[PDB]
RNA sequence: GUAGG
């Protein structure tokens, strides 16, 4: 309950406002929110976990680590 | 000793209607059931149940056992 | 008594999509201990 | 402690052969135990005395033709296993068969020696065409439960002896069934219901009175190791 | 094991770990990731110390512990407070007298913890064969072992309050004195007119027992006769005290009694408020659902006698029974994987020079040496193969008379229960997570 | 209906121990059977007493005899197994014999026939007896999943391997530019479709009939066979978002 | 054909497990045999357990007692499976009673005449120096598993708490069956079942229990008819 | 609002 993020609320996408799109998975949704657990109700996709590694950027943006690999 | 306890097929015959057979029954059943509540006025309008009679029952059950022995008989206005 | 009164009278079993006519049926009652009902598996799978 | 209601097993009967008994409110999970160990003893534990060996004249094992009969032989050995005997000699014993001439031989025509009975007469063995020639005898000997045909080098005895298959369970089948029932408020009670269809050689109450005396005295066995008390009635 | 599971169930495992509810005693997953541990100690129910001390006096309401530098910290543990929910959220406690204490160790568990490592159910024995139609459909058949042994039992709070708000007419009144009731209902309440502790109620109860102020009565001839007759009198003040609600039983473990004229402030209007509590433990019964952790969920069916169970050939009963047409057409394989390697963890096994590729891989991560009973680690993705499960199937450790219940292929003969005969093929058995 | 269609099957479905017996009756099948001697699967010669109608292709066919005879009603032998025995016995006296496998579509015929003769009483019955017996002996089928149940096929690494070559060269003769993105795309498409329908064929060539999964999946019970391809077989292609 | 009547003979591999061999059995009769002798032998034997208990300064099973680092809701779970042999058909009473820090066991329990616990070394919970346990246990006899609300016949009593009990002593038996040495077609079986009981009594007396009830139920569906 | 269907 404390991790997960939620597109519902005010000034953003609400249960109606919802398309196909928006719920599906993105490549980009990849160490910044996990694929897996969401609400399997009417509210698919809408609601999602924080990844295991995830991290807050101070804009508001999620950064992910990544071990750097130099010279093969 | 069941409600399937008389076979439906028999009464299907016997009443040409699958609507025709509840709402003959019914009328049976409730006048059976008014007999009952009777509770000693004696109206001579007024039958008993045919066939013999258990210490406790359901008066359709007695209704669609006559039907099935086919003692009674209905006629349309 | 309450074993006594309930046979021979037909109660009606219902799911609740209902998409078809065979969403309500009728059964004979029968006591059983426990707080779940217990239904035939025959007629399961017309209810889904 | 002691068994709220005790049990008490009756008859109903359908048929001259086949009868079914019902055991009234039995403790929780007692019903199975019985059920199989009552079908398992009535289908073996009961002796009896059946055929083991048959023998046509001039015929060889590997012939299955019979002359002078339309039948064949496998339908022979089916007839002649599904006739009943009644011996008690416990050794084996040899009855015969001769008769000529078309027609029917049927089991009123057996001739069974002294100490061995065919209790029904009435089982149509072989039809005839033309000639008779009919000539066939056979070994009896008593057994307990089921034994399948197995070769036991009586062929090189005699080419036209084969083994057949014997049953010696003067009952046919037993099938057992639980079903709950509710007393005393409380539906945590058993009822066992067996159906034994046997031959009409032996009543089945006979029969069950038998087996419930071998498995007592087969758990009675256990009595040995010390002297206990259980709740009854 | 999460490779092998298809998407959509491991989905439906991860949405159902959220919904267990602890347990009287948890025990950790003997077959699970090593990352339990840290999402419970990053968790705040449980209660780790916050400096490495030492501790003194062991009691369960509370634990003393002193630092070296001379800072006593007493802890204080929770015990059977309503969750939001509503289930208990007892606290245990791990730490002994004399041990030593670095900052951040758990010293007591939360609600479904085991020695600060997560446990939200427990590993039953389980085989796959149908069963006479009790598990047709995805229902489930287990032992009454479980209902013998407490395994699968929680305790659950319920809280209702009643407050003596004042009205037009006049002030409520909270008292012993009810109208028209009989003496023996109020047999448990208290002069004060408040049920006692540890009072047992069922449905109809009385728990506080509130009097209205009055109401306009216009009393009917009938009533007046009857009253007349009797000589009895039909006071102003009507009865409105709470009951315990229908289909509701339990044992009154706490009450909470808020005054008004004292220092405590309510709300306006209302005098005095009493909030009282009703705890009961419920045990596992008919028509309970139950998971696993691999989106395989459904509804308890029968709980049959001990010995009706399909017992292995030692002797064990099984526990649990599923039904095996699930597998192939919900594609989740993993659960199946699973159960072998919750057997390997069960008895445990020894591989030492063996000298085989398997070997060799378990040697040098060291997984290669263990006894019965000891947890096992398979990361999400970096878990183990199906060569190693074979292998260990293989060389698993006998259990008695020197020999192995299950067979290479993972199998196992059960006899029957009920019958008493052999099944004709060996069937599946092994250990699974329950929650 | 997996009960049903393990006792209706052709042999194989175990070791055929004990099989072309000829057996006086139904009656001494079932006593050999807990003998262990005999096994449900083995094509024996059964005789029926009075009253068991032939079956419906066996009514031209009739014994050898000099008089007529009318095998229609009375006594007859057949060459069948001791399953179909059972399971004819559960049918209705009236209803004709059958000697086939029920699986789901021929058991939802019969029913179809039964619920079409036959007055309703006497279908409830027959239906509730189909359930206990196939409940029993889908109980005494055995059936499971486990390690070594769901094997993959040998000759899945070798013809994968080999298409991965063949992908290797085209990708290799894209870094050249000789060959479009978008016609690259289109051939690897073509060549997995291939190598993903070969590999279901060998793995279909290769589970024998006995497996679990085979047993109810073929049957009709549940399960439809792409799931087994990806369970078992590459899954294959996957469709990009949007 | 051969009629041979069934023999018995024990051996003991531990004090509290033994094996017993019947040889002479009918084909297809030592599985059948050995599954009635198992249902029966974990059905229903007598036995004694505690039945309801009484703590001082307790009102329910939910609080916590001082002193003590398990509450009551553990200790009930820690004596349950406490194991107990009674002789007394009416209830008879024990009394607890532990003080200073330590470690309460079963060990530590007063036995009135007549009624012994059988497993000593089982610890029950561990007190501090401050800590004080005083408690009372109704201790009765039956068979097999009853539960705690069956077992509760007192409303008035707020202190005393009832527990769900299990009388029966025995833990779990097995059977196997083997091929006759005898050279016949039937092939005959010997029966060897392998039985393991609590502390509380030895097997053998627990399976001449399980004879008794299985002849006196057995004979009860003989003697009827004829 | 969020869970289960």
Redesign the interface.
């Known amino acids: 309950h404390k991790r997960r993020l939620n597109a519902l609320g005010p000034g953003g996408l609400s249960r109606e406002r919802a398309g196909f799109?928006v719920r599906?998975?993105?490549?980009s949704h990849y160490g910044r929110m996990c694929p897996?657990?969401?609400?399997?109700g009417p509210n698919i996709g809408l609601i999602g976990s924080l990844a295991s590694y995830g991290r807050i950027n101070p804009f508001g943006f999620i950064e992910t680590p990544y071990r750097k690999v130099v010279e093969g | 000793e069941g409600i399937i306890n008389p076979p439906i097929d028999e009464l299907l015959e016997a009443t040409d209607s699958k609507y025709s057979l509840v709402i003959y029954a019914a009328k049976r059943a409730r006048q059976i059931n008014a007999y009952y509540s009777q509770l000693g006025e004696g109206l001579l309008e007024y039958v008993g149940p045919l066939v013999d009679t258990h210490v406790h029952e359901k008066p359709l059950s007695i209704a669609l056992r006559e039907i099935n022995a086919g003692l009674l008989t209905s006629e349309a206005i | 008594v309450l074993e006594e009164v309930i046979a021979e009278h037909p109660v009606l079993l219902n799911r609740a999509p209902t998409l078809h006519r065979l969403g309500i049926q009728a059964f004979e009652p029968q006591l059983v201990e426990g707080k779940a009902i217990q239904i035939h598996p025959l007629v399961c799978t017309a209810f889904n | 402690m002691l068994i709220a209601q005790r049990p008490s097993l009756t008859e109903e009967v359908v048929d001259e052969f086949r009868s079914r008994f019902v055991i009234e409110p039995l403790e929780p999970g007692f019903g199975y135990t019985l059920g199989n160990s009552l079908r398992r003893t009535l289908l073996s534990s009961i002796p009896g005395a059946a055929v083991t060996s048959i023998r046509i004249d001039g015929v060889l094992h590997e012939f299955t033709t019979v002359p002078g009969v339309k039948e064949d032989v496998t339908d022979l050995i089916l007839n002649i296993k599904q006739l009943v005997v009644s011996s008690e000699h416990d050794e084996p014993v040899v009855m015969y068969l001769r008769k000529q001439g078309p027609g029917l031989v049927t089991a009123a025509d057996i001739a069974p020696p002294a100490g061995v009975e065919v209790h029904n007469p009435d089982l149509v063995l072989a039809t005839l065409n033309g000639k008779g020639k009919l000539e066939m005898e056979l070994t009896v000997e008593r057994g307990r439960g089921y034994v399948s045909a197995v070769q036991n080098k009586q062929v090189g005895q005699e080419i036209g002896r084969i083994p057949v298959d014997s049953i010696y369970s003067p009952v046919l089948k037993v099938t057992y069934k639980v079903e709950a029932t509710r007393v005393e408020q409380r539906t945590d009670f058993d009822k066992l219901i067996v159906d034994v269809e046997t031959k009409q050689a032996m009543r089945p109450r006979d029969a069950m009175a038998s087996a419930g005396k071998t498995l007592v005295e087969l758990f009675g066995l256990a009595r040995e190791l010390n002297i206990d008390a259980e709740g009854i009635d | 094991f999460l490779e092998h599971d298809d998407a959509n169930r491991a989905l439906m495992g991860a949405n159902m770990m959220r919904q267990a509810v602890p347990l009287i005693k948890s025990e950790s997953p003997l077959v699970g990731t090593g990352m339990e541990y840290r999402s419970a100690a990053d968790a705040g129910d449980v209660v780790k110390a916050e400096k490495a001390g030492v501790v003194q006096e062991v009691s369960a309401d509370y634990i003393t512990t002193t630092n070296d530098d001379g800072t006593y910290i007493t802890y204080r543990l929770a015990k059977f407070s309503r969750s939001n929910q509503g289930t208990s959220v007892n606290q245990k406690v791990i730490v002994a007298e004399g041990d030593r204490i670095i900052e951040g160790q758990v010293l007591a568990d939360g609600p479904a913890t085991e020695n600060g490592e997560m446990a939200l159910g427990k590993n039953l024995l389980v085989a796959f064969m149908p069963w006479e139609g009790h598990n047709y459909e995805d229902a489930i058949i287990l032992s009454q072992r479980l209902v013998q042994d407490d395994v699968l039992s929680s305790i659950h709070i319920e809280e209702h309050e009643v407050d003596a708000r004042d009205t037009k007419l006049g002030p409520e009144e909270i008292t012993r004195d009810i109208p028209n009731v009989s003496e023996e209902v109020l047999a448990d309440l208290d002069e004060r007119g408040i049920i006692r502790i540890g009072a047992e109620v069922v449905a109809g109860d009385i728990l506080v027992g509130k009097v209205t102020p009055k109401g306009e009565t216009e009393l009917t001839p009938e009533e007046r006769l009857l009253r007349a007759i009797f000589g009895e009198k039909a006071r102003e003040v009507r009865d409105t005290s709470l009951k315990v609600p229908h289909g509701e039983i339990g044992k009154v473990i706490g009450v909470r009694v808020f005054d008004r004229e004292e220092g405590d402030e309510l709300p306006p209007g209302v005098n005095q408020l009493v909030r009282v509590y009703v705890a009961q433990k419920r045990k596992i019964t008919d028509g309970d659902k139950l998971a696993g952790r691999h989106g395989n969920k459904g509804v308890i069916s029968k709980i049959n006698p001990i010995e009706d169970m399909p017992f292995l050939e030692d002797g064990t009963p099984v526990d649990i029974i599923l039904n095996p047409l699930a597998v192939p057409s919900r594609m989740n394989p993993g659960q199946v994987l699973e159960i072998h390697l919750g057997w390997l963890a069960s008895r445990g096994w020894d591989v030492s020079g063996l000298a085989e590729e398997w070997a060799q891989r378990l040697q040098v991560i060291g997984a290669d040496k263990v006894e019965p009973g000891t947890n096992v680690a398979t990361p999400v993705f970096d878990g183990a193969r199906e060569d190693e499960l074979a292998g260990l199937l293989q060389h698993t450790i006998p259990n008695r008379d020197g020999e192995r219940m299950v067979l290479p292929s993972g199998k196992a003969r059960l006899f029957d229960g009920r019958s008493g005969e052999p099944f004709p093929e060996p069937i599946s058995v092994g250990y699974m997570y329950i929650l | 209906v997996l009960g049903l269609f393990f006792l209706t099957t052709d042999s194989e479905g175990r070791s055929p121990k004990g099989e072309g017996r000829a057996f006086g009756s139904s009656a001494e099948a079932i006593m050999a059977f807990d003998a262990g001697d005999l096994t449900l699967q083995a094509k024996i010669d059964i005789r029926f007493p009075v009253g068991t109608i032939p079956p419906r292709g066996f009514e031209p066919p009739a014994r050898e005899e000099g008089e007529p005879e009318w095998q229609q009603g009375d006594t007859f032998t057949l060459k069948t197994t001791l399953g179909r025995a059972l399971f004819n016995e559960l049918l209705p006296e009236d209803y004709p014999f059958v000697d086939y496998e029920v699986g789901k579509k021929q058991l939802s015929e019969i029913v179809n026939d039964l619920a079409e003769r036959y007055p309703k009483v006497i279908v409830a019955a027959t239906l509730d007896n189909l359930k206990a017996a196939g409940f029993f002996w889908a109980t005494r089928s055995g059936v499971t999943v486990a390690i070594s149940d769901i094997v993959v096929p040998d000759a899945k690494k070798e013809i994968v391997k080999g298409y991965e070559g063949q992908d290797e060269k085209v990708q290799k003769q894209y870094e050249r530019g000789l060959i479009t993105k978008e016609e690259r795309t289109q051939e690897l498409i073509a060549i997995w479709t291939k190598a993903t329908n070969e590999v279901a064929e060998a793995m279909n060539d290769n589970f024998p009939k006995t497996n679990p999964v085979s047993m109810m999946v073929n049957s009709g019970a549940r399960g439809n066979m792409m799931q087994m391809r990806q369970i078992a077989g590459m899954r294959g292609l996957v469709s990009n978002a949007k």
């Open positions: 799109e599906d998975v993105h490549p897996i657990e969401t609400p399997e």
